[PDB]
Design a protein around this ligand. Structure first.
Ligand SMILES: *[C@@H]1O[C@H](CO)[C@@H](O[C@@H]2O[C@H](CO)[C@@H](O[C@@H]3O[C@H](CO[C@H]4O[C@H](CO[C@H]5O[C@H](CO)[C@@H](O)[C@H](O)[C@@H]5O[C@H]5O[C@H](CO)[C@@H](O)[C@H](O)[C@@H]5O)[C@@H](O)[C@H](O[C@H]5O[C@H](CO)[C@@H](O)[C@H](O)[C@@H]5O[C@H]5O[C@H](CO)[C@@H](O)[C@H](O)[C@@H]5O)[C@@H]4O)[C@@H](O)[C@H](O[C@H]4O[C@H](CO)[C@@H](O)[C@H](O)[C@@H]4O[C@H]4O[C@H](CO)[C@@H](O)[C@H](O)[C@@H]4O[C@H]4O[C@H](CO)[C@@H](O)[C@H](O)[C@@H]4O)[C@@H]3O)[C@H](O)[C@H]2NC(C)=O)[C@H](O)[C@H]1NC(C)=O
Ligand SMILES: *[C@@H]1O[C@H](CO)[C@@H](O[C@@H]2O[C@H](CO)[C@@H](O[C@@H]3O[C@H](CO[C@H]4O[C@H](CO[C@H]5O[C@H](CO)[C@@H](O)[C@H](O)[C@@H]5O[C@H]5O[C@H](CO)[C@@H](O)[C@H](O)[C@@H]5O)[C@@H](O)[C@H](O[C@H]5O[C@H](CO)[C@@H](O)[C@H](O)[C@@H]5O[C@H]5O[C@H](CO)[C@@H](O)[C@H](O)[C@@H]5O)[C@@H]4O)[C@@H](O)[C@H](O[C@H]4O[C@H](CO)[C@@H](O)[C@H](O)[C@@H]4O[C@H]4O[C@H](CO)[C@@H](O)[C@H](O)[C@@H]4O[C@H]4O[C@H](CO)[C@@H](O)[C@H](O)[C@@H]4O)[C@@H]3O)[C@H](O)[C@H]2NC(C)=O)[C@H](O)[C@H]1NC(C)=O
Ligand SMILES: *[C@@H]1O[C@H](CO)[C@@H](O[C@@H]2O[C@H](CO)[C@@H](O[C@@H]3O[C@H](CO[C@H]4O[C@H](CO[C@H]5O[C@H](CO)[C@@H](O)[C@H](O)[C@@H]5O[C@H]5O[C@H](CO)[C@@H](O)[C@H](O)[C@@H]5O)[C@@H](O)[C@H](O)[C@@H]4O)[C@@H](O)[C@H](O)[C@@H]3O)[C@H](O)[C@H]2NC(C)=O)[C@H](O)[C@H]1NC(C)=O
Ligand SMILES: *[C@@H]1O[C@H](CO)[C@@H](O[C@@H]2O[C@H](CO)[C@@H](O[C@@H]3O[C@H](CO)[C@@H](O)[C@H](O)[C@@H]3O)[C@H](O)[C@H]2NC(C)=O)[C@H](O)[C@H]1NC(C)=O
Ligand SMILES: [Cl-]
Ligand SMILES: [Cl-]
Ligand SMILES: [Mg+2]
Ligand SMILES: [Mg+2]
Lengths: 839, 838
């Protein structure tokens, strides 16, 4: 079995870089706290007991309210009068830093105005090793460079609006199957623990960890550790990933929270680098916690050093201050658990005051315009044989497919969006929000047509192929809408247990396209989907005159696609993943079977860095549509590639020592931390207090009281100055990684008759034997008027040209010659240059 | 068994009234025709053989093209790039002469531009004796006066746009069950003929015939005779209804066509007053006809007098000339049978040229605006507890019910509209058109809300009561859409064989309302339906703050209802029928069982004139919402009723004689009418020519050749001058009926704060025993600004105050005292006056 070696102690915060002032303030206030006040910040109060999906204990003596933590990465979950933004995969499709930032800002505004302190997003894990992975859509792209940039901008936008962002899921949660033992049980498997993702150190650094470095460098306040194991150590107690990679190497100064029921042990997790238990209980509404009283006891009995729990509270408070939450705080003004105006303060048990739990605060502002715009700008034009844009003089339009129409249960009619009924604007699970409304394609396009003389019919039963054919036969243009859905592992839709069982269109989609294309010579296909689908059977049909991929656009879906189809927006999105001929062209099969007996199933990441386009390139598979590809209503030309070497400082591997750990504040006698007698204990609520000064009894852990060496690795309680890792030194790693080595410029010209955007892309060949032919490094979306030329300049950093050396435990720019390729897809790379050796 | 007495001969045209010039011209051209040319005009060419649902033969020698006849009363059937207008029942709900006319004009323009010569509409039969009758919605109202006025205006509009209108279905086709023997067979009944409607002479005159008098007086070109029997004599060979009532009494100068396969015999129909056989064959694609060669033979063998077939051609050509079709003619530029560009000229057999059969001509003009308007103006506000109009600042709107949503097969996805899927904008059968598009309530209201900050959810599964409740709970206002559907007898939807099996909301509708009202304190209910529904289970729920009936609004449905709900239009429609507590409150049960053994089922019209509100009034049944009732966003008051007796000419019962019948043109030897040698005969096509000069063989009728007295009533071939009937004398009867006897005026005032329309109504009590307490006679829709007053002046004619006297066979103003009642519904009649004797 794969083994995750120990890395201890859990590094303590030090106010490095831009965290200096908030670290000082965090220390100042945590120094004033009692042990139980500190424990309160670290532990949620239990599932469904307050307003938000996660809520910490409060520190009322110091005027610190409970931190409210709320899903999702695309909008506020379980609320009202809020917006539903396009999914993260759409943002990836924009290839646009500014739209990622703006979306982050707009989301942060809405979260803030509902009284939410922590947004549980954005996501770069799963990255997207498996195209059928159920949650890839919540993130960005399988490409680490593209994902990292847009992850970071999203984080900056959320945090500039005064809400803590949470980089999730850290790390290697690349599939839903077996992510949780009780879920697997409920699906009829018998396994003793969650799936283990087994991955080598090079691949970890060069692929899966890379976007998390970006998040740390961008100043992200929190990281959410994952449900799965890595090398058979749970995400929320993996000392290698949390202590060594995230904290020691990347220099992360904020706090690690668990995914919901991803916390498995009190002492183990705390020493392995967890900082916050959510939603606080052992299991939902168990009325027990791995922390709470257990964390109080674990400190009181001398096992968990005071400096470790102090560090947790310093990290949490530093983040809270870093986004200015102390100045922006407002109390939650909604409830996650009901839409009623009135209800019990503690919903799961019907206790506390019966009070106004929803104030119905309109937080939407004008964010609808931004959502519409991102929807248009994330629409990838894959094929256009002079079909588009439409004129609005078409004699008859046919709108075809269930994906054009309405969810007859309402936009929010399926809990957690757990269905594929009507237009697919949002995929399923906890990465969801309630729609304030949903504009369907049927609605938007009919409205467009009815401004002129056009006739229009909408056939939204995908199983009525006779009716689809008949409408298609009469039409000047047939607009076919189709979809493929997936989601979080706890929710099964038509037997798809989060992960999608195939990558074929749902709801008879291939047959809708074929029936339409057989009856209409001008058939345009629009795909709403969580990721790539198989299009081999119909994409080159001579009647399929248009193909677009529109992802999961949120509330303005219809309007976003109409804008593109009628030419108000000239599409300029590029594919953020590869469109292959078969499922098998992708490699990386999901682990769908209990492949380790009754033990934890094992998923070995033997593909290494060769996922998505890197796999296709290595195995010489030809994509139908490649990573980075998309069309436009104009044409562009790239020319005049130049490389400017920059006078850069040398890389200095980091050396020396940290400071020794510090205790902040004092801990007294066990008696100080017993429950106050007049406090009415709410049932199932998780408090920091102990029942009595009997510590064994107050914990109730039937294995309580062993000597440390029986169950705690060496060094886990060592508070001395520790060595600095060579690849450490700053936020996101050694600052020498982010030294600029080269400026690379290229001319981009709009050679056609319509204004539009191009996405020029810079790929590098790092050189040497089992390195990918190309990996993406830089890109930009540039708007050009007809005939306009602009020179695009980007930079290559040391890190962009480096490889992870497992022996040095450092990033190294290898002696192999490096070559750059510039173009407008991962396969349309007409320009190139050999780079000189960099300093 | 009820018996229909003989009335013969079939009266011949005489260019009466406004028909004088076109009669002259018709005679002139028919005089030039050979027998087979004449027969060609009288007989369709067979089902699915040419472009239109009906097409006559042509007269190419005289440059007369084939007459193209097309459904429906609400828009062109089986075509493209056309409009779908609101149904006739919506027109009735407007109570607006002008909207009826304008809709007629708009329809006529579209029919004309497709190359259609005859619109198969409008309808006043079924009138609406049975609230569950499947086709009442195609017509106007069970009230004859309201129906007659709006029937007539519709006819005038169609004909002023240059298309022949067809007054249908004549007469007593009050239900779909058993209307046709083969339909009944297909539904598992064994009956030897169609249902017979048995109805007394008084009731016929005072109720069912009345709107047809209006049609005739309005100059209607054609009448379609019905599938049913009247007193056990088929509609298309009933000598009493066609010869005596329509032709002799009402003076009808145009032509009678059969409903499609309603023609039952060659000689019998011709002498009983039929003028045109549609679609021309005995049964669909039989390749035989009751006329065609049989009519040629029936003349050649001396049975059917020449004057009878000449008269048929005169009546047909006179109608064609009356609307100016000779100047407006354009060839049909579409096909009923396919939407493909190219196809065979003769669709059913794939013969003739393979040619362009659809030219896709856009005939819609700007008619969409008129459709949206009529939709708004036909929406009856039944209840409003300060819910309406909406502001567009409502925080969250819930749209609830399948009737709010889309037909997922497309607007035209069910053949002949034979389903109740998504919003109900058009009911089913032949009275249908293809939508150019359909705006759903979901679409229009979401669009409205999205102009502001309102959140909005649409739950359009009427079975997902949990989802309905949840959305309703969150809403500031819940807009519940519900429906009830019906249609023509040939098509069964969910076991409803045209006629609806009950008058309860379809698709779980009562439950949708209740679920919504239990969860939302501001629930507005919008009903789209063919006619009245039962609302007793929720109408007075304290959370039902609004109730509207929007009928069948056609293509702009969503926009029409949004206009009303958001107050761009202040609703002023009144109910054109009664909303009762139970089905039983209406009386008039349908005949749903083979009630006469294996014979023709019998339906006796024992209720007489007492249908709809007249029944309620007689049996002291209290309607939930009465005939003529509707609310508005303002209030009105009526006052100062005055009655002025007028200096009227006396009624003179008509006397004297007609002219004797005339032959127009000559008939030669049988050999002149044999098929021409070189003519390629299209299979199944109905031609006027005979196979040979052997007449018996050319007919092939296995009972051919009896002496007349064995199977033809006395007088049926009598061409002598005939007596004029006392109640005859002009178009729609004796012109003394239309003399004004009283001028009646009343003041109407808008006493509220919004501009709006009121519909003042004048009812009369004709007096005597077994007469209704009140019957509607006059009405008008009047627009008033807040505080504005206007005086409405109308008249009462002799006919308005008369009764049909079975002994005199005449209309008589009886000596019983008459009283008038003025108000704004059939029960809100605060003003009254006894009339002096005229
Ligand atoms: C103060 O106070 C406090 C509070 O109050 C307290 O505390 C307490 O304490 C106690 C003691 O005393 C405890 O208990 C314990 O615990 C433990 C732990 O757990 C956790 O973790 C795990 C893992 O581990 C690992 O890791 C970590 C981190 O993460 C660390 O820490 C450790 O040390 C380790 O390490 C290792 O490895 C790594 C990698 O991975 C590396 O790196 C290093 O170096 C090393 O090597 C896990 O597993 C767990 O989990 C589980 O559980 C949970 C709950 O908690 C859940 O949730 C999950 O799911 C899971 O489950 C599963 O499994 C189980 C079992 O366990 C079952 O049952 C189920 O069913 C399933 O399947 C966690 O998380 C532990 O371990 C322990 O236990 C043990 O013992 C018992 C008794 O007998 C049994 O039963 C079990 O089984 C076990 O066993 C084991 O061991 C033994 C000895 O010890 C042996 O014999 C056996 O064989 C086994 O072994 C195996 O395994 C191991 C591990 O892995 C290895 O090592 C080996 O090799 C083999 O393979 C107990 O339980 C508790 O916890 C606490 N509490 C709290 C609340 O905190 C104290 O005490 C006080 N003090 C005074 C003085 O007073
Ligand atoms: C020239 O040419 C031409 C052409 O080509 C020709 O013609 C022809 O002719 C033939 C003869 O010959 C014919 O046939 C015949 O016909 C008849 C008629 O039919 C129809 O109608 C009916 C009714 O009737 C009624 O009405 C009318 C009017 O509307 C009239 O016209 C008549 O006359 C009558 O009358 C009566 O009544 C009324 C009331 O209603 C009154 O008003 C009066 O006064 C009187 O009384 C009907 O019914 C029919 O119908 C049926 O048919 C159809 C087909 O067509 C169908 O669609 C329907 O549905 C029905 O059916 C049912 O029925 C049947 C039976 O009929 C069966 O089969 C089935 O299944 C079902 O159920 C029509 O519309 C007829 O009638 C005839 O028949 C007869 O006879 C046979 C043999 O014998 C038998 O079978 C039958 O049954 C019958 O019988 C009867 O009658 C007889 C005498 O006539 C007697 O004897 C017996 O007994 C019986 O009786 C009974 O019944 C009746 C009835 O109603 C009564 O009346 C009694 O009383 C009793 O009860 C035959 O068929 C044909 O049509 C023709 N064709 C064409 C194309 O046009 C000619 O011929 C030529 N000419 C030369 C010289 O050559
Ligand atoms: C990849 O992964 C996806 C997702 O898991 C897999 O998709 C799933 O594939 C299975 C297997 O094919 C599907 O189950 C099938 O669903 C069929 C359709 O079910 C729906 O429609 C039924 C019938 O609906 C028609 O008829 C009714 C009444 O007769 C009408 O109301 C309705 O409007 C329809 O009318 C049409 O058809 C009738 C004739 O039947 C005509 O007369 C009409 O004119 C008109 O043309 C209905 O009963 C049912 O309740 C459904 O609503 C079903 O027939 C078949 O037996 C089977 O159950 C899943 O639905 C599908 N799920 C998803 C999410 O797509 C996919 O298979 C997989 N691919 C591969 C290659 O592994
Ligand atoms: C302190 O943390 C410990 C865990 O380290 C908590 O003890 C654990 O509490 C859970 C209840 O949430 C126990 O689960 C129960 O186990 C029985 C055993 O068969 C099972 O039948 C129940 O369905 C349930 O799974 C678990 O056994 C227990 N673990 C041990 C080793 O004692 C404890 O509750 C925490 N204390 C506080 C104050 O929250
Ligand atoms: Cl919710
Ligand atoms: Cl059609
Ligand atoms: Mg191929
Ligand atoms: Mg226990």
């Amino acid at each position: 079995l794969a083994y995750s070696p120990p890395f201890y102690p859990s590094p303590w915060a030090d106010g490095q870089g831009e965290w200096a002032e908030v670290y000082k303030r965090a220390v100042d206030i945590v120094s004033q706290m009692t042990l139980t006040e500190k424990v309160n910040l670290t532990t949620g109060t239990g599932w469904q007991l307050e307003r938000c999906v996660g809520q910490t204990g409060s520190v009322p003596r110091l005027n610190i309210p409970s931190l409210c933590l709320q899903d999702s990465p695309l909008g506020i979950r379980f609320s009202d009068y809020n917006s539903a933004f396009p999914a993260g995969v759409n943002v990836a499709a924009t290839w646009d830093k500014t739209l990622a930032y703006l979306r982050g800002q707009a989301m942060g505004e809405e979260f803030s105005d509902k009284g939410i302190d922590v947004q549980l997003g954005p996501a770069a894990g799963p990255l997207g090793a498996h195209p059928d992975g159920g949650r890839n859509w919540e993130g960005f792209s399988p490409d680490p460079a593209l994902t990292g940039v847009l992850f970071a901008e999203t984080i900056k936008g959320i945090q500039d609006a005064g809400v803590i962002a949470t980089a999730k899921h850290y790390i290697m949660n690349e599939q839903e199957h077996f992510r949780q033992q009780p879920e697997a049980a409920g699906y009829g498997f018998n396994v003793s623990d969650s799936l283990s993702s087994n991955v080598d150190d090079k691949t970890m650094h060069e692929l899966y960890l890379w976007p998390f470095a970006d998040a740390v460098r961008a100043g992200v306040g929190a990281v959410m550790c994952s449900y799965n194991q890595i090398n058979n150590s749970y995400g929320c107690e993996n000392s290698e990933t949390l202590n060594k990679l995230l904290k020691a190497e990347l220099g992360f100064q904020g706090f690690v929270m668990s995914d919901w029921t991803a916390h498995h042990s009190g002492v183990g997790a705390a020493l392995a680098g967890l900082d916050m238990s959510m939603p606080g209980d052992v299991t939902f509404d168990s009325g027990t916690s791995f922390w709470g009283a257990n964390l109080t006891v674990g400190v009181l009995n001398g096992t968990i050093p005071q400096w470790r729990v102090d560090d947790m509270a310093v990290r949490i408070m530093a983040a809270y201050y870093k986004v200015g939450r102390d100045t922006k705080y407002t109390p939650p003004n909604f409830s996650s658990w009901t839409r009623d105006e009135y209800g019990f303060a503690h919903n799961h048990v019907s206790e506390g005051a019966y009070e106004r739990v929803n104030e119905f605060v309109d937080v939407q502002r004008d964010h609808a315009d931004l959502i519409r715009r991102i929807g248009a700008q994330s629409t990838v034009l894959l094929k256009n044989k002079g079909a588009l844009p439409l004129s609005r003089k078409e004699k008859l339009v046919a709108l075809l497919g269930e994906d054009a129409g309405s969810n007859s249960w309402g936009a929010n009619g399926c809990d957690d969006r757990g269905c594929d009924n009507g237009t697919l604007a949002m995929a399923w699970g906890s990465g969801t929000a309630n729609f304030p409304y949903l504009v369907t394609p049927e609605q938007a396009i009919q409205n467009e047509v009815l401004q002129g003389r056009g006739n229009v019919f909408a056939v939204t039963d995908s199983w009525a192929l006779d009716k689809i054919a008949a409408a298609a036969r009469q039409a000047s243009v047939s607009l076919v809408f189709v979809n493929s859905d997936s989601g979080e592992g706890y929710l099964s839709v038509d037997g798809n247990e989060g992960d999608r069982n195939n990558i074929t269109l749902w709801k008879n989609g291939d047959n809708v396209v074929k029936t339409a294309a057989n009856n209409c010579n001008n058939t345009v296909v629009i795909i709403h989907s969580v990721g790539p689908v198989l299009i081999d059977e119909w994409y080159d049909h001579p009647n399929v005159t248009g193909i677009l991929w529109a992802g999961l656009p949120g509330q303005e879906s219809g309007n976003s696609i109409a804008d593109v189809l009628y030419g108000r927006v000239n599409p300029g999105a590029k594919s953020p993943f590869t469109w292959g001929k078969t499922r098998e062209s992708y490699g990386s099969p999901l682990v769908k079977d209990a492949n380790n007996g009754n033990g934890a199933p094992q998923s070995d990441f033997t593909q290494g860095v060769f996922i998505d386009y890197r796999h296709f390139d290595k195995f010489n598979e030809t994509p139908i549509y490649e990573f980075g590809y998309g069309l436009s209503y104009t044409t562009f030309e790239l020319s005049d590639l130049h490389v400017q070497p920059l006078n850069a400082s040398r890389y200095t591997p980091t050396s020396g020592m940290t400071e020794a750990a510090k205790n902040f504040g004092e801990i007294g006698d066990a008696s100080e931390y017993v429950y106050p007698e007049g406090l009415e204990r709410i049932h199932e609520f998780i408090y920091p207090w102990i029942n009595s000064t009997d510590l064994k009894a107050s914990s109730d852990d039937s294995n309580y009281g062993w000597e440390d060496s029986k169950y705690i690795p060496e060094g886990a309680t060592d508070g001395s100055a520790q060595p600095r890792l060579p690849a450490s030194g700053g936020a996101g790693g050694n600052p020498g990684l982010y030294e600029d080595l080269f400026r690379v410029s290229v001319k981009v010209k709009n050679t056609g008759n319509v204004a539009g955007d191009e996405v020029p892309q810079l790929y590098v060949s790092l050189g040497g034997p089992n390195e990918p032919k190309v990996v993406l490094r830089k890109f930009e979306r540039i708007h050009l008027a007809p005939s306009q030329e602009a020179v695009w300049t980007t930079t290559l950093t040391r890190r962009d040209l480096a490889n992870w050396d497992v022996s040095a435990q450092d990033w190294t720019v290898t002696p192999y010659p490096k070559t750059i390729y510039v173009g407008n897809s991962s396969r349309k790379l007409p320009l190139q240059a050999s780079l000189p050796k960099a300093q």
